[model samples]
Target chain A: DFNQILTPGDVDGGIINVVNEIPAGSNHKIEWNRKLAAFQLDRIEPAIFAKPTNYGFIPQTLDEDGDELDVLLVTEQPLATGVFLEARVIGVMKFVDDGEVDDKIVCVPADDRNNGNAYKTLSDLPQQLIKQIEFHFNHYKDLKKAGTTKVESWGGAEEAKKVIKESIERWNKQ
Target chain B: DFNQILTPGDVDGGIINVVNEIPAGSNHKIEWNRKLAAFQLDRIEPAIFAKPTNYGFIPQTLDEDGDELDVLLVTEQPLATGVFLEARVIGVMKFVDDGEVDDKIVCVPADDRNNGNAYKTLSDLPQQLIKQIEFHFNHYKDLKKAGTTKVESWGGAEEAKKVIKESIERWNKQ
Candidate 1:
């Protein structure tokens, strides 16, 4: 329908969580943290100081009543026992079509700490890590527009240089 | 890294528009109303709407710059002149490591529209279609979780009945 037509090419900015790691098949929670510009987990397993064997995943999205939604599993790597699992998801499932497919509404499940990479394991990850993922998502968009999958990584030394230069510029302005 | 761990189960609501009316090989600018949840078409070809031609396929995801994301294109129906595409999402991405090779990132797109019918045409859409889409996204989670997809029209009639019954019950108490 022609309803809600704009002049087109209008751009607005909003933050979408680009990278997240929780253990596969575990109960975890995530809530928006405006200060951090990302969602933060209320608690994480292993308790950090506890035994390393106590590894598990956390659930992210919550329903209106604060119940865990069913999870949809998406992974970039195969199912291995020892290595870490990493995924780059473009999306997540929030709702299903109808009553017949009730269990269908769920989140994307990443593997656990032991078998998967330790990307999303800590109770609270360094905000820099989250920032790196966000940077990747934004940079990847530039690559996509250029029609290439190869893009610069925020985790790299070059990226570090860029950040430092930007930081210096900001400090100078101040 | 411990930084990437996330609890991936939280349910957030969204509506995605699958591009279906643009010319192949030519680029079209697609925009969504962040608040209202609708489509904004900027630079589609002049020939597309000329004689009822089907655009490119409905992509599973969008690039960070709002381009189409790379994904496996599987469709129950062919892209026609008037087909509408929508989806409800669940989770984000993660990175996993294998025994030897570089880390891999994967995407899992899930939670299809229950109607089984995508939008049929560009016309015949609601005035506040984007708002309607958002309403459906936020409201559909509970209805589907409670098991209503199997019902006809996503149990639209039944939902109306339940709401009316509750309203009447409240009125009686008052």
Candidate 2:
């Protein structure tokens, strides 16, 4: 299937492929069933929490959670599920869920014509955007367990690329 | 039906009832079929937009749109659909949708213990919250027609009560 065949993308060139599983403004814990190359519904979050941004994963890569590396794409509009978009990495949130490393890499669309590509990095985005993202993630899983998630910090593009590289290598090894 | 019997709570007593139709973080254009006293799915918004705050209407009131008066309840957590809660009007937005007056009353839960009643007025709320609310309403209907929705201005509590009182009178005349 295309999902399995698609490379992690040209990360060094400042672009990568993101298979959107859960769009922004949604809380459906949808995921990519790599084996079937189809979308899978994991579970729904409580109505109190909606995903602060578009959520997806890098194809052909794995993370510490033993699954595809997760990503948070900031955009003016929320894309539909299963959309393959070209995006540039901006930053990464060092997050841990249930004591496992569940880092969320942050990105923006490669071609943001609506804003004329104004967002170059996380700092370039609105301060409230990051705060909202942190707030949502911090409390999203509260119903499952009040303290099940933690966002240690948000780092810059360089830090995000390193996480991407590690995940790519992890994918090849696995 | 209970929905019709509900008196929209006590407006002057610093409390009112808000029957949540569309909870925060969702885009389904659900509405109260007033005559039938049942919830009806009118349409769904594009994935690009989600309700930033809880949306409901004051019972026994009518607006220029020939529908029940609308309100936007600001809360840290999203309430479930069909749940009724006591709320306080803090402000009003002079919104015009499709060339019709669609004022949206702004409010907060009456029992806001989470922040221990930190928000007393619209000014007491975060500036970003207002921006987000305006942004959502401004663009949510873009897919149907760009520039179709216009938020003319926002006013203080006194102004909101005036609109609410007018709507109550409008309901009586109808």
User: Each predicted complex: what DockQ?
Assistant: 0.02, 0.05
Candidate 1 residue-wise lDDT, B5-76, digit = tens: 211222222223332333222334343333343345754433322211123222322222333221111222
User: Could you give the interface RMSD of each candidate, to one decimal?
Assistant: 16.1, 8.4
Which prediction has the highest lDDT against the true structure? 2
Interface RMSD of 1: 16.1
User: Residue B46 CA error for candidate 1 (Å)?
Assistant: 58
> TM-score of the B chain in model 1?
0.21
Worst-scoring 10-residue span by lDDT in model 2 chain A: A137-146
List, residue by residue over A1-174, the lDDT tens digit for candidate 1. 100121111011111111222333222222223233332333222221111111211123223333222222333332221122222222222221222211111112233455453432222235563354334323432321432222222232232223223323433343
lDDT of each: 0.26, 0.82
Q: Highest TM-score: which candidate?
A: 2
TM-score of chain A of each: 0.20, 0.96
Candidate 2, B-chain TM: 0.95
Off by over 4 Å in 1: A1-159, A162-174, B1-154, B157-174
The fnat scores of all predictions, in order, read 0.00, 0.00
